[PDB]
Amino acid sequence: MDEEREKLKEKLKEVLRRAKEAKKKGDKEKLIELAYEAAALAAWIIHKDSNDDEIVELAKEALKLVLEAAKEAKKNGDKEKLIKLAYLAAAVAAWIIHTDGDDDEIVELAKEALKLVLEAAKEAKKNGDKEKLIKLAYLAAAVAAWIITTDGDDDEIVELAKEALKLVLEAAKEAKKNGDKEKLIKLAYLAAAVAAWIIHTDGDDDEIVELAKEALKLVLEAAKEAKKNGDKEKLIKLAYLAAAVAAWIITTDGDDEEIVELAKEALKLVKEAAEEAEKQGDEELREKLRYLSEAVREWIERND
Amino acid sequence: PLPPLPPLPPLPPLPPLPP
């Protein structure tokens, strides 16, 4: 068998035992320490796809421990341990999502971890740390992107995804001011994916249309940097996102002079990526980029 | 030993397209 799976299994089961003892006994700071160790054990024990159900339960119970340690740390008033616990909760959540896909109680646990990170990101802005702001926004968007796919019907998911989109857009602006562009590209990816799912599942309002515009101009500038770094692979996916967001805005809200400008820029981006994908040989992406390019032209050119 | 802190998760799948 896999001796490391077994050791990680009994080691994580140990930490949960000690944590349930420290909670019963009354010491809180060790319960936060044990939460740190439970999260690292959980996220690593599911770092690749596993079939054993016992592995995914310990991960969920570890997440439950992180959330319990998060609500005690908020009452004691330590902001920095609250931010780290919020980071751990979302990271563990999204790794449980990646491995097990969809079970029943991960929806409510990931929703609780999403609200926790949105609070920490607001609190991280109050402290002024840009590194933690980006990572928390990355997690919020990654988690929100999944929840709206599998749930979608819940009313609270809309607001949390909108707050996550608004959050990653701010984090993508400070990442532009730091200098690192690879982090900007990944934040733009999340901005488009979330913006597209929000318009997909819930339609439009005044705020969704404004946020989607910002996510669209964000991925356009990100794909402009991806062309400078000479990376064909991330370029074609960014062009997909640009067209997708532009398509969801036009087909639901319509277009003004601002939207047609961004749509045209995204359209010339897709035609360049459709050329690069046919060179590299991506049959599925080649025919989806043609679908986008045609659908966007038909909508733009209806007043013509 | 003790495993490292949880890394950032992989990116979510691509979103669907309008009808």
Numbering used by the authors:
A (entry chain A): 0 to 303
B (entry chain B): -9 to 9
Give the original sentences from the paper that presented this experimental model.
Here, inspired by natural and re-engineered protein–peptide systems, we set out to design proteins made out of repeating units that bind peptides with repeating sequences, with a one-to-one correspondence between the repeat units of the protein and those of the peptide. We use geometric hashing to identify protein backbones and peptide-docking arrangements that are compatible with bidentate hydrogen bonds between the side chains of the protein and the peptide backbone. We design repeat proteins to bind to six different tripeptide-repeat sequences in polyproline II conformations. The proteins are hyperstable and bind to four to six tandem repeats of their tripeptide targets with nanomolar to picomolar affinities in vitro and in living cells.
Reasoning that proline-containing peptides would incur a lower entropic cost upon binding than non-proline-containing peptides, we decided to start our experimental characterization with designs containing at least one proline residue; in most of these designs, the peptide backbone is in or near the polyproline II portion of the Ramachandran map. For the polyproline helix, there are roughly three residues per turn, and, probably because of this, we obtained more designs that target three-residue than two-residue proline-containing repeat units. Crystal structures reveal repeating interactions between protein and peptide interactions as designed, including ladders of hydrogen bonds from protein side chains to peptide backbones. Our results show that by matching superhelical parameters between repeating-protein and repeating-peptide conformations, and incorporating specific hydrogen-bonding and hydrophobic interactions between matched protein and peptide repeats, we can now design modular proteins that bind to extended peptides with high affinity and specificity.
